[PDB]
């Protein structure tokens, strides 16, 4: 009954940010120590909780969302941010309660010749709602003429590729991100840290 964080953090392939993955965690013992005692993480920011006291708390359930973005975009995975990622790919609510963990994955997700598997949504009519996941690939109409599913002037495929090559500067390197959100409804708590 021990929470499967290894399935999340150590997955061989991560999702593209536009199609971010979500793992529901329930009915298990958390043990966040293995996370916050790791030197491997370039970012570990918590909101509404103390990482210190994580191992002594309970929640109705936990969500672990995971994806890959550019280094320069990690700052956008936080309440109250704007930008292409927060606006069109992955949006945290203002009242977010949880942790954002990010680490440089240049060794896994960069390829000499450039890895282009990971994509982000560049065109969208409006901002995502918090925790909204948009996976449409409909041609984006930027002008007054209908696209009818054909790419051309003013008719753009909405997803665009990151170009991850090992010699990129760090702001252009891929980072793996896991967002833990902690959910407290009005039901029995099924995710507790080891001291509970």
């Amino acid at each position, epitope marked *: 009954n021990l929470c499967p964080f290894g399935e999340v953090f150590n997955a061989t392939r991560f999702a593209s940010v536009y199609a971010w993955n979500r793992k529901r965690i329930s009915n298990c013992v958390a043990d966040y120590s293995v996370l916050y005692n790791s030197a491997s993480f370039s970012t570990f920011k918590c909101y509404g909780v103390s990482p210190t006291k994580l191992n002594d708390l309970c929640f109705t359930n936990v969500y672990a969302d995971s994806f890959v973005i550019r280094g*320069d975009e990690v700052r956008q995975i936080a309440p109250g941010q*704007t*930008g*292409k990622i927060a*606006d*069109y790919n992955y949006k945290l609510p203002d009242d977010f309660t949880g942790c954002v963990i990010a680490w440089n994955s240049n060794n896994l997700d960069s390829k000499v010749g450039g890895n282009y598997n990971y994509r982000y949504r*560049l*065109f*969208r*009519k*409006s*901002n995502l709602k918090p925790f909204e996941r948009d996976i449409s690939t409909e041609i*984006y*109409q*930027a*002008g*007054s*003429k209908p696209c009818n599913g054909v790419e051309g*002037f*003013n008719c*753009y*495929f909405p997803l*665009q*590729s990151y*170009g991850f*090559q090992p*010699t*990129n*500067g760090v*702001g*252009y390197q891929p980072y793996r991100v896991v967002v833990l959100s902690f959910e407290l409804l009005h039901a029995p708590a099924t995710v507790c840290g080891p001291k509970k």
Partner: antibody, heavy 118, light 110 residues
């Protein structure tokens, strides 16, 4: 036909205000990354401001707090409200459509001259 | 903030010759985020190249872009009198989101 037609430029005293406007045809302003870029006389290009189709806005450090970019969906036009103008804001201001990695700044208006002077 | 330094500042070449214009960024940027523009006097800039190498619509094949990391190049083969202009590189991948080089002025000999 697609086009971007700018207007509103003219002479203003330092400290004054001016509102630039950019009427679009073909392009749907509210569906595009729309930018203002300026060029002082004899000098290079300097990005000023951007508004995203979702509404997010960003500004160059040199105009932050003084300029405000906006748009009117019903008029299909983009605006740049310029407050507390100084001599260093004298320039030709271009509005332009930005496509980022899908095509960079592919379409530019023809520019309107703003002169800040006593 | 990133700085784009173009070189040379001025260039004088004969028709038929080949112009090579450089852009050196103060830090490494991905090639997907670099573009080149041509500005003729009294006109808006015209996009030549984006993503370091992709020709914009209307750009003839004698214009070609290359480079990566901190160094990018615009090459103009078989120069013509109408190529007289100022050429600007631009990056759009790093804060504040857009930065132009200071331009290379190209004069055509005769």
């Amino acid at each position: 036909e697609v086009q971007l037609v700018e207007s509103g430029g003219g002479l203003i005293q330092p400290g004054g205000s001016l509102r630039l406007s950019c009427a679009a045809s073909g392009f749907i302003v509210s569906r595009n990354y729309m930018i203002w870029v300026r060029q002082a006389p004899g000098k290079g290009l300097e990005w000023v401001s951007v508004i995203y189709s979702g509404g997010s806005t960003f500004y160059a450090d040199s105009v932050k707090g003084r300029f405000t970019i906006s748009r009117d969906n019903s008029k299909n036009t983009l605006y740049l409200q310029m407050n507390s103008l100084r001599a260093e804001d004298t320039a030709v201001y271009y509005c332009a459509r930005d496509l980022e990695v899908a095509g960079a700044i592919d379409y530019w208006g023809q520019g309107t001259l703003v002169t800040v002077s006593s | 903030e990133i700085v784009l330094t173009q070189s040379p500042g001025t260039l004088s070449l004969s028709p038929g010759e080949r112009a090579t214009l450089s852009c050196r960024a103060s830090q490494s940027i991905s090639s997907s985020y670099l573009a080149w523009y041509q500005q003729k006097p009294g006109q808006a800039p015209r996009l030549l190249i984006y993503g370091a190498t992709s020709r914009a619509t209307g750009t003839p094949d004698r214009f070609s872009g290359s480079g990566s990391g901190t160094d990018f190049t615009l090459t103009i083969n078989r120069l013509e009198p109408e190529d007289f202009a100022v050429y600007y590189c631009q990056q759009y991948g790093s804060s504040p989101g857009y930065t132009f080089g200071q331009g290379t002025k190209l004069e055509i000999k005769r």
